[PDB]
Design a protein around this ligand. Structure first.
Ligand SMILES: [Co+2]
Ligand SMILES: [Co+2]
Length: 324
């Protein structure tokens, strides 16, 4: 019936067209130490975020999940400003990034105390059921993440505590997979600690190009997201053409009730600005929150993909994901 958004509860029935994985702001852990030269210009970056949300609305999107980790610049109050100014629903998360590119020394120290997993559990409950900092905003998903080929010991604590917190709240889990690895293992590890696969999104499933690997993960009964459309070449990413071919194999198999699509945009980088070198810059060309609507879905349509399979993926799936 209801979901925690950054404006408070919203009926799941009103979510309609949803993107499952976009960032209004995002930073690599450490951006905070570079504050002098990488300042966070709020009004400029709110303007940008606001245009991003208008661009999504012009294509019928009524809800975005922003799964920005706690250690990657999550900022619920800033998202509430975006929601207030556009009427877009924005569901936010609680969780940390994977060990490779996250902030690990804090919870590694607590591991030595023996309190880490409960501490993380306790943080999931607080932010899911109470609110985040002095914000009054609750998280609507638990964000999880693993490394390349390994769900590390560190990562495993967050996974086990996420299973505990979901058993108690019925909360949704959205994960990160690194470079197309560990989708099946995440699904296995989660159900083995009792999590409910009807509330799990294994993410960046499109980073893997072998449909057997998709079907293996899909075998657990979980959702998968093809959520990096337009990310090409960078961070081991395959091409949009390889992603489309993969999604085709799975639509053909009838798996559309388990699949969701998004772009994983970062609309405002936290920290000091940068440019990509003209190789990669040109291959990253289409990484904007409109590419699904202008390029991706058209090409699906050309192939015979029917409107209602689309809808199943952008409407029916989010509805059911968030429903009890
Ligand atoms: Co990710
Ligand atoms: Co992301």
């Amino acid at each position: 019936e209801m979901v925690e958004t950054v404006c408070g509860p919203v009926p799941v029935e009103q979510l309609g067209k949803t993107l499952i994985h976009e960032h209004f702001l995002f930073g690599y852990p450490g951006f905070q130490g570079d504050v002098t030269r990488g300042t966070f210009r709020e009004d400029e970056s709110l303007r940008v975020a606001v245009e991003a949300a208008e661009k999504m609305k012009r294509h019928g999107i009524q809800t975005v999940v922003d799964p920005t980790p706690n250690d990657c610049g999550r900022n619920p109050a800033f998202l509430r400003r975006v929601a207030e100014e556009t009427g877009l629903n924005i569901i936010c998360a609680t969780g940390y990034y994977y060990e490779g590119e996250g902030a690990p020394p804090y919870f590694q120290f607590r591991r030595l105390l023996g309190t880490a997993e409960d501490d993380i559990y306790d943080m999931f409950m607080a932010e899911l059921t109470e609110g985040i900092a002095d914000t009054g905003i609750k998280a609507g998903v638990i964000k999880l993440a693993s490394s390349k080929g390994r769900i590390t010991e560190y990562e495993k604590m967050f996974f086990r505590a996420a299973a505990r917190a979901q058993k108690e709240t019925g909360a949704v889990i959205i994960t990160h997979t690194q470079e197309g690895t560990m989708g099946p293992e995440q699904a296995a590890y989660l159900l083995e600690h009792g999590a409910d696969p009807k509330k799990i999104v294994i993410g960046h499933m499109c980073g893997n190009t072998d449909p057997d690997y998709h079907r293996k993960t899909l075998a657990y009964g979980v959702y998968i997201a093809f959520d990096r459309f337009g990310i090409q070449g960078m961070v081991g990413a395959p091409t949009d053409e390889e992603r489309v071919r993969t999604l085709l194999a799975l639509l053909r198999d009838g798996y559309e009730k388990q699949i969701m699509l998004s772009h994983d945009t970062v609309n405002v980088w936290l920290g000091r600005p940068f440019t990509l070198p003209e190789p990669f810059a040109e291959m990253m060309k289409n990484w904007h929150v409109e590419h699904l609507f202008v390029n991706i879905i058209p090409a699906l349509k050309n192939e015979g993909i029917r409107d209602e399979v689309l809808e199943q993926m952008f409407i029916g799936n989010p509805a059911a994901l968030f429903s009890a």
